[PDB]
From a paper:
As with other coronaviruses, the spike (S) glycoprotein homotrimer on the [name]-19 virus surface plays an essential role in receptor binding and virus entry. The S protein is a class I fusion protein—each S protomer consists of S1 and S2 domains, with the receptor binding domain (RBD) located within the S1 domain. Previous studies have revealed that the [name]-19 virus, similarly to SARS-CoV, uses the angiotensin-converting enzyme 2 ([name]) receptor for cell entry. Two of the antibodies, B38 and H4, blocked the receptor binding domain (RBD) of the viral spike protein from binding to the cellular receptor, angiotensin-converting enzyme 2 ([name]).
Author numbering:
A (entry chain H): 0 to 217
B (entry chain L): 0 to 215
C (entry chain A): 334 to 518, 520 to 528
The structure:
């Protein structure tokens, strides 16, 4: 059988809520191995979470003690992580891994988001090009995609016909609990009067789609 | 006291063909209890080295690990395009268990390029909502180190901005950065001059872009 | 006829923990206060009996088990503990009556470049029973494919070396450990003075 770890169970949870992750193994026997959960919060490094020994002993990172429980089901050759009393800082991609001499087999990861926010589509505001061609000949314009939840949003320009010079930035998590992202494009300043620029924003979790035309002001 | 694993540097730029060295320092002696991993965006880590110097099966021979005690190194003898990635060391049989280093991101070296800087006032549509977001754009610069200083009527702003940076562009290896200054509408209307001042190795002196509230 | 504790505590060589040594002590007089008052021991913990008041007791047999582990693992040599050592190498019972004694042995058991003579069992399917000693070196089968004595993927040599080096942090340094177990079934054979 192919060697693989296939995770599932990630999703959105409110603070204080619970979630169970699963990790179905092939190509080795879960109950015969040191098996771990390792997580990675957005933009951060790896953090070990919990381990279960072949003989059954279990250990936990101090940051999850008393809240998380690791377990396995031998007949299903599957590892589990039961997560209770979840907190916003538990938001991360969770990986399962087998440890022999180092962690040689890893799952694909499953995403867990812990947040009080409710699903909400973005407001889309123009980043209008300045009235002055500041000496280069290149103008910048864009869309600000503000106050949505959860991730992700997709942005294209002119229905995908404009790709050169586009930068869509990683979203930031605001203190409100909602995300915000900007997408910009640089174009020849001589194009501002001849070409229409529309950013197409799609937020599938809210079934929201917005097209915003971005033009010079006054 | 717990052993701390410190990786240096946090960011490293190199060229295809270069010999690259990444370092992990343990706060106390840990013999050869160390593993190295590679991770690319959106993917699981991959084991490269264990027992500090033993190459994991299937990993190309240009990767080697060395060290014992408190200083460990991962060396890539001749860098290949597929090697740009983040690398993590991990302390084995540690107390507390499985301590990781904070990671070294290996990026593509190129010549210095100054950012083009743009400032965007809040839209009238957003202002109707009661909030003002001011956006400063730093476009196509290298290296990634850049500082944005917001100023409102020449008062330096701290605590009311957030920023985000793209990954290296696939064609020209530059970065772009966007910073957002957020104020209430009532606060936005108490001031006139909105400016973002950018400092970067490619600029001999900091560059300021500004506007006056009300196109003034 | 004094009990031969010097043979155990001052032995030139100590066992690996997976192959832990057991010495039977009988038909002798033991003065335990000379050990408890030593200042050379960083661990001296007794269970069931009290550290002082030890020389007033009699037993049918005393066992002295001894081995080397790292400092971070000495806490596992106690009733009710878990970990690679308690689970797979040396297990005390919940109802243990005895004393656990340990001291740093970096100056004897570490070597420049690493002392690799001391091993522990890293892979085992199930936990040891109390006072069980597993000396098997069979390749450990971590998947459904038999190993046929060849190390490789899912096929691990079950013992690992500590590789003690003198520059190790204290938790990675070697500690010599003596476990005294007090057995009473039959006339008492090992008694305190007078
Ligand atoms: C070990 O040797 C020292 C030094 O001679 C001695 O003082 C000590 O009593 C000995 N230990 C035992 C248990 O006899």
């Amino acid at each position: 059988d192919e060697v693989q770890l296939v995770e599932s169970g990630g999703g959105l949870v409110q603070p204080g809520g619970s979630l169970r992750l699963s990790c179905a193994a092939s190509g080795f026997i879960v109950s015969s191995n040191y098996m771990s959960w390792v997580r990675q919060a957005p933009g951060k490094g790896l953090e070990w979470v919990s381990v279960i020994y072949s003989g059954g002993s279990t250990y936990y990172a101090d940051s999850v003690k008393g809240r998380f429980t690791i377990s396995r089901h031998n007949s299903k050759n599957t590892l589990y992580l039961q997560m209770n009393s979840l907190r916003a800082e538990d938001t991360a991609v969770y990986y399962c891994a087998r440890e022999a001499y180092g962690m040689d087999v890893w799952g694909q990861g499953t995403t867990v988001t812990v947040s009080s926010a409710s699903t909400k589509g973005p407001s889309v505001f123009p980043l209008a090009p300045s009235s002055k061609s500041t000496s280069g000949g290149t103008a910048a314009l864009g869309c600000l995609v503000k106050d949505y939840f959860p991730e992700p949003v997709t942005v294209s320009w002119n229905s995908g016909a404009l790709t050169s010079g586009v930068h869509t930035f990683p979203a930031v998590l605001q203190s409100s609990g909602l995300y915000s992202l900007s997408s910009v494009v640089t174009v020849p300043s001589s194009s501002l009067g001849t070409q229409t620029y529309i950013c197409n924003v799609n937020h599938k979790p809210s079934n929201t789609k917005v097209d915003k035309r971005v033009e010079p002001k006054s | 006291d717990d052993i701390v694993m410190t990786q240096s540097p946090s960011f490293l730029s190199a060229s295809v063909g270069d010999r690259v060295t990444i370092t992990c320092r343990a706060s106390q002696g840990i013999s050869s209890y160390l593993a190295w991993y590679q991770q690319k965006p959106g993917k699981a880590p991959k084991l490269l080295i264990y027992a500090a110097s033993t190459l994991q099966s299937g990993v190309p021979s240009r990767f080697s690990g060395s060290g014992s005690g408190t200083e460990f190194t991962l060396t890539i003898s001749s860098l290949q395009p597929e090697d740009f990635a983040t690398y993590y060391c991990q302390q084995l049989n540690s107390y507390p268990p499985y301590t990781f280093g904070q990671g070294t991101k290996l990026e593509i070296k190129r010549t210095v390029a100054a950012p083009s800087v743009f400032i965007f006032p809040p839209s009238d549509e957003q202002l109707k909502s009661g909030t003002a977001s001011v956006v400063c754009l730093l476009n196509n610069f290298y290296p990634r180190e850049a500082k944005v200083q917001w100023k409102v009527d020449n008062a330096l702003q701290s605590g009311n901005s957030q920023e985000s940076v793209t990954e290296q562009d696939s064609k020209d290896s530059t970065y772009s950065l966007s910073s957002t200054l957020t104020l209430s509408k009532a606060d936005y209307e108490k001031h006139k001059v909105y400016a973002c001042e950018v400092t970067h190795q490619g600029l001999s002196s900091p560059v300021t872009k500004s506007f006056n509230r009300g196109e003034c | 006829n004094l009990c031969p504790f010097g043979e155990v505590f001052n032995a030139t060589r100590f066992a690996s923990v997976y192959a832990w040594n057991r010495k039977r002590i009988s038909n002798c007089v033991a003065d335990y206060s000379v050990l408890y008052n030593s200042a050379s021991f960083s661990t001296f913990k007794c269970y069931g009996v009290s550290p002082t008041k030890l020389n007033d007791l009699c037993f049918t047999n005393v066992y002295a088990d001894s081995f080397v582990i790292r400092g971070d693992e000495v806490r596992q040599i106690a009733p009710g503990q878990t970990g690679k050592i308690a689970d797979y190498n040396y297990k005390l019972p919940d109802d243990f009556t005895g004393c656990v004694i340990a001291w740093n042995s970096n100056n004897l058991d570490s070597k420049v470049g690493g002392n690799y003579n001391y091993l522990y069992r890293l892979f085992r399917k199930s936990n040891l029973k109390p006072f069980e000693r597993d000396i098997s070196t069979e390749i450990y089968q971590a998947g459904s494919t038999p190993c046929n004595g060849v190390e490789g993927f899912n096929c691990y040599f079950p013992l690992q070396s500590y590789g003690f080096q003198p520059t190790n942090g204290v938790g990675y340094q070697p500690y010599r450990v003596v476990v005294l177990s007090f057995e009473l079934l039959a006339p008492a054979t090992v008694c305190g003075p007078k």
